[PDB]
Scaffold this active site. Sequence first.
Site, mmCIF file in Angstrom:
data_model
loop_
_atom_site.group_PDB
_atom_site.id
_atom_site.type_symbol
_atom_site.label_atom_id
_atom_site.label_comp_id
_atom_site.label_asym_id
_atom_site.label_seq_id
_atom_site.Cartn_x
_atom_site.Cartn_y
_atom_site.Cartn_z
ATOM 1 N N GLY C 149 38.032 -21.022 -6.322
ATOM 2 C CA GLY C 149 37.934 -21.927 -7.420
ATOM 3 C C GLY C 149 36.668 -22.563 -7.755
ATOM 4 N N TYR C 155 29.345 -25.003 -1.675
ATOM 5 C CA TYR C 155 29.538 -24.419 -0.223
ATOM 6 C C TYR C 155 28.181 -23.885 0.026
ATOM 7 C CZ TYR C 155 34.446 -23.941 -1.043
ATOM 8 O OH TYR C 155 35.905 -24.242 -1.582
ATOM 9 N N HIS C 161 31.266 -29.745 0.175
ATOM 10 C CA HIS C 161 31.996 -28.901 1.148
ATOM 11 C C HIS C 161 31.492 -28.643 2.757
ATOM 12 C CE1 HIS C 161 35.318 -29.092 -1.752
ATOM 13 N NE2 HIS C 161 34.953 -28.195 -2.723
HETATM 14 C C1 LIG Z 1 47.473 -23.727 -1.856
HETATM 15 C C2 LIG Z 1 46.068 -23.720 -2.581
HETATM 16 C C3 LIG Z 1 44.963 -23.971 -1.967
HETATM 17 C C4 LIG Z 1 43.703 -23.646 -2.339
HETATM 18 N N1 LIG Z 1 42.686 -24.128 -1.625
HETATM 19 C C5 LIG Z 1 41.457 -24.125 -2.201
HETATM 20 C C6 LIG Z 1 40.275 -24.321 -1.275
HETATM 21 O O1 LIG Z 1 40.242 -24.943 -0.077
HETATM 22 N N2 LIG Z 1 39.177 -24.178 -1.761
HETATM 23 C C7 LIG Z 1 38.904 -23.437 -3.144
HETATM 24 O O2 LIG Z 1 37.780 -23.254 -3.258
HETATM 25 N N3 LIG Z 1 39.886 -23.010 -3.884
HETATM 26 C C8 LIG Z 1 40.955 -23.188 -3.425
HETATM 27 N N4 LIG Z 1 42.240 -22.814 -3.968
HETATM 28 C C9 LIG Z 1 42.085 -22.126 -5.431
HETATM 29 C C10 LIG Z 1 41.841 -20.522 -5.432
HETATM 30 O O3 LIG Z 1 40.679 -20.243 -4.262
HETATM 31 C C11 LIG Z 1 41.747 -19.780 -6.655
HETATM 32 O O4 LIG Z 1 42.947 -20.133 -7.701
HETATM 33 C C12 LIG Z 1 41.618 -18.379 -6.413
HETATM 34 O O5 LIG Z 1 40.455 -18.106 -5.669
HETATM 35 C C13 LIG Z 1 41.836 -17.489 -7.701
HETATM 36 O O6 LIG Z 1 42.068 -16.491 -7.567
HETATM 37 P P1 LIG Z 1 43.270 -15.377 -8.381
HETATM 38 O O7 LIG Z 1 43.062 -14.104 -8.279
HETATM 39 O O8 LIG Z 1 44.501 -16.114 -8.042
HETATM 40 O O9 LIG Z 1 42.834 -15.810 -9.874
HETATM 41 P P2 LIG Z 1 43.492 -15.685 -11.158
HETATM 42 O O10 LIG Z 1 43.574 -16.882 -12.109
HETATM 43 O O11 LIG Z 1 44.686 -14.884 -10.938
HETATM 44 O O12 LIG Z 1 42.183 -14.520 -11.891
HETATM 45 C C14 LIG Z 1 41.275 -15.175 -12.787
HETATM 46 C C15 LIG Z 1 41.166 -14.494 -14.076
HETATM 47 O O13 LIG Z 1 40.943 -13.033 -13.977
HETATM 48 C C16 LIG Z 1 42.352 -12.280 -15.032
HETATM 49 N N5 LIG Z 1 42.047 -10.960 -14.585
HETATM 50 C C17 LIG Z 1 42.886 -10.321 -14.000
HETATM 51 N N6 LIG Z 1 42.842 -9.141 -13.683
HETATM 52 C C18 LIG Z 1 41.822 -8.722 -14.464
HETATM 53 C C19 LIG Z 1 41.134 -7.551 -15.009
HETATM 54 N N7 LIG Z 1 41.564 -6.373 -14.282
HETATM 55 N N8 LIG Z 1 40.061 -7.729 -15.576
HETATM 56 C C20 LIG Z 1 39.947 -8.811 -16.127
HETATM 57 N N9 LIG Z 1 40.304 -9.972 -15.977
HETATM 58 C C21 LIG Z 1 41.284 -10.049 -15.111
HETATM 59 C C22 LIG Z 1 43.349 -12.906 -15.019
HETATM 60 O O14 LIG Z 1 44.377 -12.997 -16.283
HETATM 61 C C23 LIG Z 1 42.678 -14.531 -14.952
HETATM 62 O O15 LIG Z 1 42.704 -15.261 -16.216
HETATM 63 C C24 LIG Z 1 43.545 -23.210 -3.744
HETATM 64 C C25 LIG Z 1 44.851 -22.700 -4.290
HETATM 65 C C26 LIG Z 1 46.172 -22.846 -3.631
HETATM 66 C C27 LIG Z 1 47.046 -22.299 -4.505
#
Ligand SMILES: Cc1cc2nc3c(=O)[nH]c(=O)nc-3n(C[C@H](O)[C@H](O)[C@H](O)COP(=O)(O)OP(=O)(O)OC[C@H]3O[C@@H](n4cnc5c(N)ncnc54)[C@H](O)[C@@H]3O)c2cc1C
Lengths: 271, 273, 272, 273
Positions: C149, C155, C161
């Site tokens: 995120g 980083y 971080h």
């Molecule tokens: C418990 C927890 C701990 C965390 N700790 C950290 C941490 O230590 N450090 C850090 O940096 N982050 C941290 N995060 C955040 C996390 O890294 C991000 O939420 C994550 O990387 C996002 O990936 P995703 O695939 O879930 O994204 P999504 O939100 O699922 O994807 C992003 C977008 O892409 C779209 N999309 C999907 N498929 C396609 C496609 N085929 N073509 C075009 N668009 C598409 C989706 O609809 C969405 O709008 C943490 C989150 C949680 C829940």
Amino acid sequence: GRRALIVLAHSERTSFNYAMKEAAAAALKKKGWEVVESDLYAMNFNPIISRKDITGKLKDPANFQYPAESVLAYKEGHLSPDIVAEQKKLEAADLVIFQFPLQWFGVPAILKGWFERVFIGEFAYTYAAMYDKGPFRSKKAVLSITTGGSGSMYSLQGIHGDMNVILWPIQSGILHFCGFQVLEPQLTYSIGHTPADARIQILEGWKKRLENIWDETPLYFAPSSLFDLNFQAGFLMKKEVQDEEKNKKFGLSVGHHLGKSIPTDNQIKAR
Amino acid sequence: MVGRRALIVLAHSERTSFNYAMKEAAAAALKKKGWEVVESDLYAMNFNPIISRKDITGKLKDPANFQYPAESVLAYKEGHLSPDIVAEQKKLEAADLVIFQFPLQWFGVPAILKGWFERVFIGEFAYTYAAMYDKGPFRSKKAVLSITTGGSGSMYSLQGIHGDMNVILWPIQSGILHFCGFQVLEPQLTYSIGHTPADARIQILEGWKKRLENIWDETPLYFAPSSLFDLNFQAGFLMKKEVQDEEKNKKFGLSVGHHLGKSIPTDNQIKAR
Amino acid sequence: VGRRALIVLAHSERTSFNYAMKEAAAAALKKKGWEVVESDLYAMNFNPIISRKDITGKLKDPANFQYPAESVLAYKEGHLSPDIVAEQKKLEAADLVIFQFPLQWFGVPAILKGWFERVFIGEFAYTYAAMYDKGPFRSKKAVLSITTGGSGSMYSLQGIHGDMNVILWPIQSGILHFCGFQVLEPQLTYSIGHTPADARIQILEGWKKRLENIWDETPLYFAPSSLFDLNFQAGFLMKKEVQDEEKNKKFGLSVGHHLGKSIPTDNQIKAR
Amino acid sequence: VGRRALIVLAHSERTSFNYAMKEAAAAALKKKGWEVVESDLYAMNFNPIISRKDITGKLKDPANFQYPAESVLAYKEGHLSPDIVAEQKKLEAADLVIFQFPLQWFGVPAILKGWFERVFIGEFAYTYAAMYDKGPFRSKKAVLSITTGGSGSMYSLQGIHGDMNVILWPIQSGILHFCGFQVLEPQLTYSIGHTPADARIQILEGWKKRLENIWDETPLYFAPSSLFDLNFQAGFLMKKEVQDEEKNKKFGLSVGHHLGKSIPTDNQIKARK
Ligand SMILES: Cc1cc2nc3c(=O)[nH]c(=O)nc-3n(C[C@H](O)[C@H](O)[C@H](O)COP(=O)(O)OP(=O)(O)OC[C@H]3O[C@@H](n4cnc5c(N)ncnc54)[C@H](O)[C@@H]3O)c2cc1C
Ligand SMILES: Cc1cc2nc3c(=O)[nH]c(=O)nc-3n(C[C@H](O)[C@H](O)[C@H](O)COP(=O)(O)OP(=O)(O)OC[C@H]3O[C@@H](n4cnc5c(N)ncnc54)[C@H](O)[C@@H]3O)c2cc1C
Ligand SMILES: Cc1cc2nc3c(=O)[nH]c(=O)nc-3n(C[C@H](O)[C@H](O)[C@H](O)COP(=O)(O)OP(=O)(O)OC[C@H]3O[C@@H](n4cnc5c(N)ncnc54)[C@H](O)[C@@H]3O)c2cc1C
Ligand SMILES: Cc1cc2nc3c(=O)[nH]c(=O)nc-3n(C[C@H](O)[C@H](O)[C@H](O)COP(=O)(O)OP(=O)(O)OC[C@H]3O[C@@H](n4cnc5c(N)ncnc54)[C@H](O)[C@@H]3O)c2cc1C
């Protein structure tokens, strides 16, 4: 003229369970059976064993035991009349059909209570005459069960496990214990996701089966002749029957598996 | 230890009974190790064991075609279940340990305890189809069966007239308790209690109280993890095809219900591994 | 015939970018004639907790249970839980392993952590005679595909971080290389949550393009095990003559073997 | 004196040294008049997997579920799963948090990892506005108590496995300090299974002795957040004037802020003036 009793445990007349009872009465009456019913919900049947089941003098009111008191009350004829009226239908009946939905891997509470209040000692079992020597060995019984879950869930590899294990305590523990010859159960799986044309086939299939229900082979339970029937031997399987069975790969039944494999569909299909 | 709660469900009418003695002994032993104890004496409560429309006190969704599964779940989420049901559901939520004390009646639970399960274990509260077995709502809790029988233990051995007691316990311990998530402890089986001499009954009571002092530390019974199965309607909730391949060559099955056509692990429903 | 790939995915949602990255990898690999097998850990309802229930036979000492000793016995006599065994067979078959996950709390998600704990048993995945570059999986290759995120500046060497190389070290060296894997350059997708839809599609195409020649890439540098005395009496310390050769260099060997000096730039991110 | 401590334990077995170390800590702390609350994660059967079932109310967008966004909404409107809420209340009450666990694959066990993921929600434990030394938990102190199977030589500067300071960094900085905790020197108990019985007793006594004055200890050094520009346009980079002050130094600030230079000896293991 033979007689049939149909015990039904569902509250709603709009249900498939009610349709299955109506279809059974139709098919049986048309082959010239006499049909008596116990619709347990429509009767407001009371399923709780209490002291109020005995209407006479208790033997020992300070230390009440339902097994001892109920048996005395049957032999001197002062049981509650709701129990007696059900006992008379059973005596008259040659075939007993239990129509119910599966609820928590068993019979509904109201049907469970019927067994508890109606199947008293001396009437339905003695410790001298258990299993295939019991009072009801001239009669036949069949379970007609409906489930919400699909048949794959109750297969050998299903999340819930073998349906043969689930039926064992009912068909052996209750029905066969009292002497009934037990027929193949009518299992109607996942009735709530079935389209209307298929439900009509199932009803027609049920009615067709009932035309020759008396001629069917019953399920296999271990004869009581394989055991020593007295308190000093422990009601254990005879030493010479243990020797005959030692080298077979399959057990006798679901309960008498003997540490080995269970014969395929012991509680669902006749041999 | 302190701050932990226990619920004791009792299904016997008579205060003079061994079942009542076993309930009193359990409350004594638990209270003295600093547990809070709540009771459901189902006969003393005059508990109603029959599912009916009167269990929902609000508006029915479809009164012309009544279905208890659908209506009871709606009534739970909008909070208009009969208050006798709600009061029992609160004891369950509070409780960490649940003890069921009953006599064996026709190879099962008494009708009044059966009805308690039917009216109190509603969908969403006690199970969903998404969260079954070891993923169910009650996975932080422990349950134990305390059963008394009229017949002797030899009758319920592998070679007894009645057959394996492990088979008889399966629909209750797996079908009801584990289905909803409970970790299920070794049952307390008190065979032929009416033909036991008076000094032996006193030992049985003392044995029960001794066991309850460290009940929280015990290992639970083995059920097949839900992770071995495909949990969705299209796959049929069948065991995964690669787990069926790993089990094909083994001599023993997993449990009493998951025997897989093979041998049942000795005392699967009576002793922990 | 061709080669096999295993794709381990740790995300619950099919609508996620992590799921898109898994689908894109399977597409690209299958089209070059790889056989592709999957472990979607959430869809499998995989159980990530080590317990006694992982051993289905007799325990050696049930009064004093030790997971390392018991699990190893249970592997050699073949009575591990079959969910563990089925995953171990996919790994044996596989030449390339791809881990697709979001960074969660500076590490792998809990469910992937549990997979490592239950599947990477002694004797199967490591011995003691065979650590690091001598381990059972030295014929295989592994790659991390991570989404964050936060942006890449956070980083970097001067970010709030801290160095991403430090964060990757316990996973890439501690888990993957320890068992023998050759570890490829990680696929880092920074700040995926502020990226518009057209840019996400380019990133997917970039990923698929990389996978066409993934087998030919050079792996990351870890210190060879030949620099150390591999036995209990010496303490598994770096040899006295290798300490003498390294004393006068300005750079250390790796992130973990920094030796009190500077860490080679992007040790855990780029090959030499 | 009138202060509270939380002890998080991640080991299944009551016969373990990890369990002994938890019992010894509760003994020593209670005797100096601390109130002690426990989370024994295996005894609780704690669920370590983030899912939608962690939110018990209406989702904002169920077609495009994101755990970060939904969990934070669910915290502010108060419909998180109660297993999460009960753990969050222990943390709020607590002044000192002790994590007792075995090192498993160079990190925390899976069940403790899941606890962090489900319990340390946004707004409760961190905001993007208040990171590191400005975070919600800056009044509290945390300490790691770790046991290893391998010997301390293997995790020295010249060991096969490499510097233990690097291994601790993602946990102590990434998780604990990020949320605001002042982090105390970790209690590192190396090669516990090949320690003779009399030496294990010393280690326990040493642990209890340390806890008598644990509140007075200096914390480990992490870079203050005041050295960085905390906003999206600057990239959260270190200020240009702080890069100028550090240009001439031989050592970096910490393990993660090494700045291409040498890492201060035992940055993550020993405190500083
Ligand atoms: C418990 C927890 C701990 C965390 N700790 C950290 C941490 O230590 N450090 C850090 O940096 N982050 C941290 N995060 C955040 C996390 O890294 C991000 O939420 C994550 O990387 C996002 O990936 P995703 O695939 O879930 O994204 P999504 O939100 O699922 O994807 C992003 C977008 O892409 C779209 N999309 C999907 N498929 C396609 C496609 N085929 N073509 C075009 N668009 C598409 C989706 O609809 C969405 O709008 C943490 C989150 C949680 C829940
Ligand atoms: C407390 C409780 C516990 C339960 N436990 C379990 C359990 O452990 N396992 C399990 O699998 N299930 C369980 N169930 C579910 C139960 O087994 C099913 O709900 C039941 O068997 C479904 O049958 P029904 O007769 O009630 O069907 P209904 O849904 O009432 O009827 C089926 C359909 O057929 C239609 N129909 C009605 N009359 C006719 C007709 N004459 N011709 C054609 N179609 C007709 C109906 O309108 C309806 O569409 C439980 C239910 C309850 C309430
Ligand atoms: C409908 C029905 C069906 C049944 N089905 C089966 C069946 O399928 N299988 C089967 O095996 N059994 C069956 N039974 C028998 C049943 O399990 C037993 O009757 C029951 O377990 C007896 O338990 P109790 O608590 O009623 O004993 P009681 O007979 O009430 O008491 C046992 C003894 O303990 C004494 N005692 C009481 N309090 C104390 C105390 N404080 N300290 C010491 N001693 C004390 C009593 O005075 C008595 O001597 C059935 C019974 C019924 C009514
Ligand atoms: C999945 C997994 C991954 C692992 N990964 C790593 C890794 O990456 N790195 C690594 O270094 N190690 C690793 N290990 C090893 C792990 O760190 C050790 O097993 C653990 O630290 C040992 O601690 P324990 O409490 O389990 O010991 P136990 O073996 O339970 O206890 C040690 C000894 O102390 C005794 N004892 C118990 N209570 C007391 C008491 N009150 N007083 C005195 N003696 C007592 C016990 O009986 C025994 O003899 C891993 C283990 C597992 C299972």
